[PDB]
Scaffold this active site. Sequence first.
Site, PDB file in Angstrom:
ATOM      1  N   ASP A 304       0.823  -1.213   0.000  1.00  0.00           N
ATOM      2  CA  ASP A 304       0.000   0.000   0.000  1.00  0.00           C
ATOM      3  C   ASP A 304       0.857   1.263   0.000  1.00  0.00           C
ATOM      4  O   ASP A 304       0.465   2.285  -0.577  1.00  0.00           O
ATOM      5  CB  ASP A 304      -0.900   0.024   1.234  1.00  0.00           C
ATOM      6  CG  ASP A 304      -2.065  -0.929   1.124  1.00  0.00           C
ATOM      7  OD1 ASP A 304      -2.620  -1.051   0.010  1.00  0.00           O
ATOM      8  OD2 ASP A 304      -2.522  -1.412   2.185  1.00  0.00           O
ATOM      9  N   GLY A 306       4.061   1.807  -1.155  1.00  0.00           N
ATOM     10  CA  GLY A 306       4.721   2.067  -2.431  1.00  0.00           C
ATOM     11  C   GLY A 306       3.755   2.197  -3.595  1.00  0.00           C
ATOM     12  O   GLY A 306       4.157   2.731  -4.638  1.00  0.00           O
ATOM     13  N   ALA A 310       0.814   6.244   1.861  1.00  0.00           N
ATOM     14  CA  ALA A 310       0.129   6.498   3.118  1.00  0.00           C
ATOM     15  C   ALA A 310      -0.184   7.990   3.304  1.00  0.00           C
ATOM     16  O   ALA A 310      -1.038   8.343   4.123  1.00  0.00           O
ATOM     17  CB  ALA A 310       0.962   6.020   4.279  1.00  0.00           C
ATOM     18  N   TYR A 390      -9.916  -0.979   3.512  1.00  0.00           N
ATOM     19  CA  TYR A 390      -9.297  -0.948   4.853  1.00  0.00           C
ATOM     20  C   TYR A 390      -8.913   0.430   5.372  1.00  0.00           C
ATOM     21  O   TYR A 390      -8.581   1.319   4.582  1.00  0.00           O
ATOM     22  CB  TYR A 390      -8.036  -1.826   4.861  1.00  0.00           C
ATOM     23  CG  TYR A 390      -8.301  -3.279   5.219  1.00  0.00           C
ATOM     24  CD1 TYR A 390      -9.053  -3.621   6.350  1.00  0.00           C
ATOM     25  CD2 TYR A 390      -7.838  -4.299   4.399  1.00  0.00           C
ATOM     26  CE1 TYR A 390      -9.350  -4.965   6.674  1.00  0.00           C
ATOM     27  CE2 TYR A 390      -8.049  -5.643   4.752  1.00  0.00           C
ATOM     28  CZ  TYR A 390      -8.820  -5.969   5.872  1.00  0.00           C
ATOM     29  OH  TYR A 390      -9.023  -7.289   6.204  1.00  0.00           O
ATOM     30  N   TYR A 392      -6.206   2.181   8.145  1.00  0.00           N
ATOM     31  CA  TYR A 392      -5.026   1.964   8.994  1.00  0.00           C
ATOM     32  C   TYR A 392      -4.818   3.196   9.850  1.00  0.00           C
ATOM     33  O   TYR A 392      -4.542   4.294   9.339  1.00  0.00           O
ATOM     34  CB  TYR A 392      -3.773   1.742   8.109  1.00  0.00           C
ATOM     35  CG  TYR A 392      -3.833   0.454   7.329  1.00  0.00           C
ATOM     36  CD1 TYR A 392      -4.457   0.404   6.077  1.00  0.00           C
ATOM     37  CD2 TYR A 392      -3.266  -0.710   7.850  1.00  0.00           C
ATOM     38  CE1 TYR A 392      -4.534  -0.800   5.357  1.00  0.00           C
ATOM     39  CE2 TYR A 392      -3.300  -1.907   7.123  1.00  0.00           C
ATOM     40  CZ  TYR A 392      -3.937  -1.924   5.891  1.00  0.00           C
ATOM     41  OH  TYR A 392      -3.944  -3.095   5.182  1.00  0.00           O
TER      42      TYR A 392
END
EC number: 1.4.3.21
Lengths: 657, 657
Positions: A304, A306, A310, A390, A392
């Site tokens: 995720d 690369g 984020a 998802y 995070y």
Amino acid sequence: AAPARPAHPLDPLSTAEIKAATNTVKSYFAGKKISFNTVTLREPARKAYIQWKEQGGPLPPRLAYYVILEAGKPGVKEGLVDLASLSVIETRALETVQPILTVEDLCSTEEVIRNDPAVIEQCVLSGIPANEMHKVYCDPWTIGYDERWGTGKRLQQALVYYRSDEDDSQYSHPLDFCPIVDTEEKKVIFIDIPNRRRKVSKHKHANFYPKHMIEKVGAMRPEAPPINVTQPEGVSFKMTGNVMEWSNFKFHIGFNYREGIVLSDVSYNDHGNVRPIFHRISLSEMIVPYGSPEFPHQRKHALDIGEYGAGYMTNPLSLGCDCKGVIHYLDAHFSDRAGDPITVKNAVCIHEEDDGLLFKHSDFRDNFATSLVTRATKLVVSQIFTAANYEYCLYWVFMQDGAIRLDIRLTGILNTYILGDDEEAGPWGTRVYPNVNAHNHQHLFSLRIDPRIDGDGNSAAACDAKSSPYPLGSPENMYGNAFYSEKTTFKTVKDSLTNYESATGRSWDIFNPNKVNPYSGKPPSYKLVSTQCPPLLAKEGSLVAKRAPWASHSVNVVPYKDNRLYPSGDHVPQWSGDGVRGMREWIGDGSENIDNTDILFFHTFGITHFPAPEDFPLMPAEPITLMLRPRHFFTENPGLDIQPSYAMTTSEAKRAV
Amino acid sequence: AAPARPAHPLDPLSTAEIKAATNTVKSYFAGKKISFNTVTLREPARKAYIQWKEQGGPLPPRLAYYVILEAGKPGVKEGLVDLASLSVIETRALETVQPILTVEDLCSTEEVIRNDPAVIEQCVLSGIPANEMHKVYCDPWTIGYDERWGTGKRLQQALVYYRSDEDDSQYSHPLDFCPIVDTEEKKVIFIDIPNRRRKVSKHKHANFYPKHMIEKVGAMRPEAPPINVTQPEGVSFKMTGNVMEWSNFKFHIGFNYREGIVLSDVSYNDHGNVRPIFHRISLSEMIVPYGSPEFPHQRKHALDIGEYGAGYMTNPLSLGCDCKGVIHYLDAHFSDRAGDPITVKNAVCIHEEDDGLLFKHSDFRDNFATSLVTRATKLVVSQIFTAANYEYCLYWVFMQDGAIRLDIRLTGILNTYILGDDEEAGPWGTRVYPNVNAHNHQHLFSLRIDPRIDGDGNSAAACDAKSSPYPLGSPENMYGNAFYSEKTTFKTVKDSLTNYESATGRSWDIFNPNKVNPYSGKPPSYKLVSTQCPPLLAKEGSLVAKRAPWASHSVNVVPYKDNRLYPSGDHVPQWSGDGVRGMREWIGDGSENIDNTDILFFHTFGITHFPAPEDFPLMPAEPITLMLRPRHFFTENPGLDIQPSYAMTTSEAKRAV
């Protein structure tokens, strides 16, 4: 004509610097049709930064790194702009890679699939009429890697779902097929269709908003009584731009499109002696490999960080909801494809919280009247990012015993694929709702530590708890109880490639072999205490193992060189995993020295997830944590000069009776 | 003439019941000089309790268990009193055991050693003049086990220290010798003296109160600004006597002299269907084995629960300091040696706290305008106990996803022994201050779970994450990514004796094989997720391994029988570890069935500690945690009917623009 210099060399590019960089690049490529993929700080070389900060050395140049595409040209171009001179100082064309997928790159895929005649045909075969394409949705993924196309086209795969109503959660209703989309042409080029067709589920959607729950279980719980947190005299931390000072820690809070939060230049003020601990710490890559071998599910192993970033994925955070209390926020700034700056407001939140007891001791001799208790406070620097399904939640936590912890909470929604009425999901997944297969997966993260423990020249070791080798009943171990810590110092890279071992309760030290604790005689260290360290379950030679060479060990230590940030390589999407780049390049033949030098310590940690119905339709938070704690760094508990919440000495207790 | 019956059969003995029991026993033994060691509830048999609670069955008799000593008789007597009839209904003499050491038993040892001529002689040889015995202190320990005396005398060992001033922390100044004290005679019977003498340290004491820190580092930190937590509309939990109801959980909070907190009859109200989860959960034993093989340090392996009692040791807790917020307290009641009730006020604290995010999801399609966020609240039931030098903070935590967690924080002071000027502490300890050797040790705990997962008839399993056995490039595992969870259901006791394994990320399920989740097809379960699971480092056949037969595996599952509480046996001090009792008795020959029956699940968890100077003179809190989480228990996330902190649907977001 140049942009103003930042307050600090590690500050992210301002919006002005971003636009100055993209103007410079557009000029350099004038008459070419180009689009911007990444425009971000090129951080100063480690030597240059340390020399500037601690040695009165040269001011490092302020540099932007860019990645662009050019219409009708394969791959990307990348390079550097010197902002002070508004000039391109380095440039090269990489025709055989593909770059990180931006929000804009991903945004157009749904409408490409809704309008594609072959996709519409598959929706109709799957039981969705042609005039209801507005009910078809997809999550736009990296293709990851597909050996049919390599990096020769820039590709996405679309994981397709259906909503009966726009407010549904679509993940109860995956469809069975997978369109492959050329990102730059905006066209579907192929559709992977299973040999066994499964039509759209006829069940109700598995929904989770209050209006849905009222239908489903009758009523919401009443509003609970509130728990209010106030800091009526303000906070104890102090920020000067992006520089934080709190409880003797000082560090720089940076942020970029890829890693998200980057903590730099972290020191601890030990009674006037300011002692470096880390030069840089961040998450540098992830991989989330799924465990169904059936085609095309091998292509579900998103890296995720690369492949999406984020920072690019990060949510704007809100006061009261995401992080409550008295909060300090930072904004993030990136470029869009046109070269204009874009802002994510309140991308980072910073606050301090109660953290229970820091230490306590009472004397039994006066029935605990002699007692000292000191409460802990923690400082939290956090972001939350969304990777399609998802979420995070990332919390960097500083504590008053000098430890630093990274806590992660995973939430959001399971990735789901369709399951036929009579189809068994196991062993590779779980039926979490009718016709819904949630495949097994791991979440693995690469923590990148550039240490400077008590200054420069560091080493790393494994520490293994071991029984004495002398047997029970020997003069050396008469009652069989002796045990010690076996420290294996890593001399060359190959030595460092180590996993967590439960059998020895393994921890790892990062230490300064040039210095000695005056009490214990041991070198000052920070010890990594980390047990959520799954083996990589994908086999050697797998796509997953090849594209994430860092993930096969819990610890990888390599020599520092500038620009060794990203361990699956600089341009991740569609790399096959063949070739000497990223961590495989840095490991080399394993023979390079890593004892008493400038090192980089990459730790693989995370979880292995076998879905259950509790995780659906929306997953309760799942925690992951690791800690770096001072050991033999201080000569005594560093928090003892914090005022106790309660203290009574023996003499005081005697006077009180 | 009988004491009033309690509100609930699991309630601890009231002070009235205690005195009624000890009156009954004194009468039964009239004309004998006896002293009370333990007077505590004998809990109803599991079958009788469940039948009373759920089947309209008989009220179980209210029974007290006692242990007494009789002057001039070896060992103990124990038995049961029926409180309704004020009669002794069971009694037996155990001449060859020794019982738990009470606060009174331990309290007299310091003055015995200060007054003993041989001890005074050793203090003078160690550099402390004979008229300064008031400066000599000792921590009174269980002798643990010494093969010179067996259980033939009731013995303590005194770990001796010196204070220059009463307000010092004595642990910087251990002395070199170890007096052995007959607890019942109040006499030193032997002194273990080392071949190499080490005289008292001449250094300053390593102190930690504010007045000391001002001398040592110049000044305290200023008072930090306050963080205030208020619940102006009260709390969401409801207690009826000792019965708790909160967020659909219901359970009984009990307490005894030995285990401390005991949670019983734990159920979850799943939308009107009240579903049992555990019949009883508690900590049932500990062992804290030290790792120096040198004599007499093999005798440092306190089984704190069985030898001193987590209830007897427990601190009175204070509002604002130990646990802050709006708090509900419970008191504890025990007997003293005279048979009188004693009270520890505020032994248990109960409160609810913010616990960050419970779950969140946002849709990228409208830049996260479509968003739901729900904050978590946790309910915490806590105690803190002091075992001489160490403090153990115990937090039983219930969470709104239906999980239950046990968090422990270790603080207080290292056990220390003297170190000569030129003496090396390693490999068995660390020099944490001049002339101070802090020996290596483990802290190991035995969590006892009596499960009733979704009702009676349960099993346990290990769950191991495994790659597919089919190779990379096979039709079955073409890209090498397939992986699954291998569930090994334990059929007989021997099967259950298992350790944590990092290589497979091992977890354990406790499940009901009689029931099936209607979505996943799996049995309802609670999964133990626990990685702080050290191997026992003491060897097979060691004193430590023999006296704590539970500690050699992370998991031990045995059949339920009544009164199988304490896995190192009922009377722990001075047992050699030889004989079939406790866990060794319950394991037997390993052949008994434990699949689909009434089982007991004993989990060994804890830490291995290699001291460093950060831990001295007062140790920052060190955390331990394990979790029991529902898996396939519910058919969906059980918290979705909690009102969200923020919710906006896609249609709502569309209307807002």
